[PDB]
Nucleic acid binder design. Structure first.
Ligand code: AGS
Ligand code: AGS
Ligand code: AGS
Ligand code: MG
Ligand code: MG
Ligand code: MG
Lengths: 432, 432, 432, 432
DNA sequence: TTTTTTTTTTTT
């Protein structure tokens, strides 16, 4: 019903006020319709008013159109008329038409993406999204509607604000009381949590400490390690939970009898979850691979995680961008968005560990202008912490957390606090 | 376009009074259009009024034209309608048509001058202007504009300027008597105004107080927050407007009945504006994202603001610098310039806040030299109010407001004044 | 490649044990391929074993098909052979085929959903899902990778993990007691180890000392020089092994007999290994050249090196990135990743040097931030030691070695230790 | 015999091991042969194994070339079949075929370069090499003989190594005793030695003194000046050799009789080489230019230098990086590496000058970190000497030479000694 | 959009 839409854009005002901000040139066929809409949009952009028939016939004459295009536009303009109908069926019909056009465009785009992917390298188009980006596009098209929320309107959105006042989101508590204090009860389900740190300063130590703490609380924890072997991460967890140093395990100070006894003592406890460590090669795993892993864990082991942990965000595959196509910032932002989408879909608290820039290394204080790969990670993330064990905290067997971005509470309340990192047992103890 | 021009010369008054002095016979054609315009001009010269269709036909009957000219003029006269187009588009389009025709005539004239110049000197026309007159002729073609407004012309716009001083066309009052006293009637449109907060003063309390005061005066306020969510800023706004303490909302002392009653009481009042709160991540909002936000609000929400309040200048990002620093002087200077450019181009009062220098923190008196942003903020800021909160003032629930830069009026007239800050309701009350 | 898939399903148990878990009739075709796979699936369901050609033909006789389908199935069944192709290529190709067929089916399904949505509610089928099911449908078709391994469990696999604790075959001792002490048993196979210092401090001296120490332990050492000639580095190795001097070799203080005697005495030792020195022009080699060099070395001589020393990573040339395609942070990190991949493929200890920026060329200490090339090298590295020499140290002939990145052990247990570097002999001497 | 080569690449493991490392895509054809080899090479790079006929067919079906190419590749693959053969006839025939194809490609590229250089500029299709590197390409066409040198074995090849210590043909002695003492016999051929002084401290006086000293010791010296005329450098050499001050030549205190007598007295001495001075405009000479100069010197003037001197490397042009494309670091490092490559190619002692940073000027000490244009120059230079002059040293007619990078010996020993530079005679004298 | 060299400048 393109002709009706154009006719009521020209000859009606309430319809124009209701539907114009959502109309786009891509919703019209490449014939007379798109060119007529181009003329209307140019006139509105230049004069901030709805053009008349004379205005468009003047705009058509002052246009660089071929004979076929000129004839089609003139015929379409001649065919326009103000058919009296109701301003409740027109709006819904226009919304349906726009949604259908958006779905059609998305389908064509994903077909083109799949055709582009199968092409051999050095011939395939670049900057075109890969196959893994197909669902996201299909998520955007279904979101088209003639209702748009731009900002929070005082006196117009106050019931929702009162609900936000009275209601509080559910929280997965930590085992460290300081994190609960700074997060008002823990972390929410569909979140992307990042623990940035320098190189060789405790990115995996903190993640393994969190994994052990969550495992002792009865959660199903999935540790996806992209840099370390499964046995290494499981040895970190064992050191955390069996109270044996990594030096003792490697040197063989502990015997198999004591190890088995401690493992069985932990097994007999009812307040214990299941921790599963999966190793992927560097750059060999993405969000879709994680979803396949979750599906096989559910089907073959009856395992549904809650505390999915990714060792390093910067190593994982983009899943939306082809490898070595965009810059580090865009690729890491895409990875963060994909991981947060996975966390929201699976209702799992997702924890990761990015790397800070070379400047932040051995720096007593860090800020958001220290992230190495991408500064867009805080925007995508829901809670971001830092590690500041630079020069003298190591001698005192301590650490420091900056709280760069905390969406659960206020970052400027307990911004910097001291953590008792114990590297032999790979754990965090509190200074209290 | 000529048909529209002639029709709206015949059947309009404002268009005629606006475009008649810039209308010439040579601008139309060498056929029916020129003859019709000659008839119109002859009628308006003999009778100083716009001719009617019957009078035009009578003049055409009593005129010296051949058969083809008679047919063309009759058809064109029969093809003129009193249709109603918008005035701005009509004036702009007829101006463009006149300019194009004048340029074509001048180019043809200079080509004819050049052709006559390359002719035997014994054999040439004397009336044709010499070649040296070519640059001037084109100038007369370029000096064709229905309305000349290039800047403010002294001695030529003194009557309009006086209407600005009497009507205070630029001032926006403050709702606080002291702030109106030192600004000679409030802040001005197209200005950047900042608050300098010493140690122990919040930057968002004063901004929320100003936003509430503007809201109570009927102004559309756009509050862009960086370090806080939309709900938190709107909660500060509610605290100030509903007289409820900030902690009372979190505790639950105020019930839904009182909240809704107060909100509907405010909604009943016709002297209330609209407040739109938009949240952006730290460092993820330059003064080009604000332009997009304004465009979206105007197109979708029809919300065109008169007050724009940015939560914190330091948290913002300089679009030109691109690189971002937590506390760098070059970025603050660029951010201030970009925000003031936005205020000027949008004709809105723009408010922001900054932290004073550490020396300014310790000293109750704050010097422009004692500012974290030196030569960057006291150079791009029309007004820079300084807020001092010492122990004695806090014990008395007061803050010392000092005026550090006042483009509006004399800085030393009323430099120091005590403000009744309420930290619970986030409000500024005057002191007798 | 349906014929290959079916042939290796029937005639290969290893292929059947990794692909049958993930296989459906929708993946193959709508003609003879689907019918053949349906026969195979029916036979394996009725009898839990892979069918044979005779059994498949008997089942085809028992099953009922139309004439065309019967002929197609007979023709396809006739075309099955063992054809022992590579397992890795076969599984990768069948994974690709399954993924592409699943994507095609998902696209057709969403197109059918969209077509059914446009139908009137009376005409539309209730079995097809709504448009809201379009995204997840496209997502479940992107999570069909072939991977049955779920990973460690920490409670169901602690016996295997303890057995893995006893697998110390990855460790390679250092011949220096301090290095073994700080590495908890020496370096590990398939790791990128770096020895960084300033210009003219002894990086190649340390590399040659490590080469000699590994040679005296019976290892095969491959020294790849990027600046010096083969005979020059071999002179340093001779100075380390024969233990006379560098100048005495060039000053004639060693007669040919003594040289012959010492070389033959070292030949008589059964604890000595093999050392090959290879030189490359600056910026002309990487793992691609190194892999061909490894293959040529293995073919020409019974030499599979356990230790691979690269004179400098920076002088090396990246495989994919051109000579000056991108900046240092990229291509240097790319070369580091390629070298680590080569080491983990060959299961060899990889040693290389790194340069330090000018800021730490005359400093008593050097940090990880003082890496002249990309900071991604101290991300792919595993044991990045650092060599610091001052005037006081050079007076005592004692270079200081600082533990910069220690992945094997605790980086701060023995952070700084003094060595006994003898520059004339190109040897590192432990200090007791 | 491309079919045989491909067939035995497929059906012969022994053949593939030797021929593959050398096979390249530019040795077969522009049609079916190249496409088949590209398929095989892609399969080998993806799976590290020789593809089978089924694998080749599968890759052919998943390929994007047209119908003609597809049919040609299919026919070629169908024609591939193993035949009873012998390893030797095949390896020798393959070597002959590869050499012939390399020669054919080389001569085609030579013709293309000749027909491209004979074109008007700005239309010469840049990125094509100039005529200067016409023979070098041919030299690459002859260095393909299936006989890659694996490397040098420490124990297997030590008689050849020992017959390189008393040879001493690599070292070229100085004339000053201190420089010989610190370098333990003088500089070595195929090296890059550098003087760092600053601006107007020396650094060309030292180069001229070295040139004169080498010339007196029966050497052919090639001075290359990028910033001075051929007569200024020759005047400096005349002042050095004839023991006549530059002021005396300027002021005419030396007669033609004395000049002629001294020149003839030098000529009649047998212990004297030939010095040739060549001038190039600043930034208008590179390694290829120097090689062309060497060739034309050998042919036209039968002059074979051994002590090639370049006045300043920083003033030369890189032969690989486009001008002003990369920063100073990369460009200067590349220039120094190319100069060292030239020196090792022609087996000459290469001497050069380098500037220091602005901070090192008028300083009593110059460190290695004070190098001006690149930190890579010290890393890619065999020997560097820093020339330091203060007011006290200038008043004493002495300069302090500090050993900054001493690759021929220990720099800690004799790090700073005082030369007796005489600026009038452009000569260095010792103080011993 | 980050990254790294070198320089030059300026601000604190
Ligand atoms: N086997 C070990 N025994 C004792 N301490 C260890 C051992 N391995 C590592 N550590 C310590 O643990 C610290 C943190 O190491 P990681 O957990 O790997 O941090 P990291 O950020 O993951 O390092 P990356 O991934 O290489 S950037 C190191 O700095 C060491 O001090
Ligand atoms: N014609 C001359 N007569 C006498 N002394 C001279 C003459 N030319 C140069 N000198 C001296 O030689 C010193 C060093 O000369 P150079 O070798 O040209 O210095 P330089 O470092 O090569 O110059 P740049 O900046 O590198 S091009 C100067 O400082 C003068 O004292
Ligand atoms: N022929 C020699 N005789 C004695 N000492 C030497 C000799 N060559 C080098 N040295 C010493 O070796 C030290 C550093 O050796 P190098 O291996 O050259 O250091 P490096 O520059 O980091 O390694 P490169 O650049 O890859 S050769 C110097 O400071 C000298 O003291
Ligand atoms: Mg880690
Ligand atoms: Mg070096
Ligand atoms: Mg000079």
């Amino acid at each position: 019903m393109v002709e009706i839409i154009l006719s009521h854009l020209i000859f009606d005002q309430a319809y124009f006020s209701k539907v114009w901000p959502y109309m786009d040139s891509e919703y019209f066929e490449s014939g007379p319709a798109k060119n007529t809409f181009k003329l209307i949009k140019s006139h509105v952009n230049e004069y901030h008013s709805v053009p008349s028939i004379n205005a468009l016939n003047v705009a058509l004459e002052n246009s660089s159109f071929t004979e076929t295009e000129y004839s089609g536009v003139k015929t379409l303009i001649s065919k326009l008329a103000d058919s009296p109908e109701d301003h409740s069926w027109l709006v819904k019909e226009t919304e349906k038409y726009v949604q259908q056009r958006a779905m059609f465009n998305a389908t064509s785009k994903i077909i083109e993406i799949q055709t582009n992917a199968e092409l051999p390298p050095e011939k395939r188009n670049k900057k075109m999204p890969d196959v893994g980006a197909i669902p996201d596009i299909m998520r955007q098209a279904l979101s088209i509607s003639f209702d748009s929320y731009v900002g929070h309107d005082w006196m117009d959105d106050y019931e929702a604000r009162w609900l936000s006042y009275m209601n509080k989101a559910r929280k997965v508590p930590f085992k460290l009381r300081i994190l609960n204090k700074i997060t008002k009860g823990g972390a929410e389900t569909g979140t992307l949590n990042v623990l940035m740190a320098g190189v060789n300063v405790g990115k995996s130590l903190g993640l393994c400490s969190l994994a052990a703490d969550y495992l002792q609380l009865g959660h199903n924890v999935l540790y996806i390690s992209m840099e370390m072997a499964e046995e290494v991460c499981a040895k970190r967890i064992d050191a955390n939970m069996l109270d044996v140093s990594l030096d003792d395990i490697d040197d063989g100070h502990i015997s198999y009898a004591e190890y088995k006894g401690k493992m069985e003592k932990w097994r007999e406890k009812s307040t214990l979850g299941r921790l599963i460590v999966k190793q992927y090669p560097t750059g060999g795993a993405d969000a879709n691979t994680f979803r396949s892993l979750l599906n096989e864990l559910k089907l073959k082991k009856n395992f549904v995680p809650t505390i999915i942990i990714v060792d390093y965000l910067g190593i994982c595959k983009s899943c939306r961008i082809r490898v070595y196509s965009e810059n580090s910032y865009t690729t890491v932002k895409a990875i963060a968005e994909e991981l947060r989408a996975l966390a929201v879909e699976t209702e799992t608290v997702l924890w990761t560990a990015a790397q800070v820039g070379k400047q932040a290394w051995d720096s007593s204080d860090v800020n958001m202008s220290d992230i190495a790969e991408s500064a867009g990670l805080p925007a995508t993330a829901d809670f971001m912490l830092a590690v500041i064990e630079t020069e003298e905290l190591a001698a005192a067997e301590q650490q420091l957390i900056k709280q760069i971005k905390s969406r659960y509470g206020d970052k400027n309340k307990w911004n910097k606090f001291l953590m008792g990192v114990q590297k032999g047992n790979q754990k965090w103890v509190e200074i209290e």
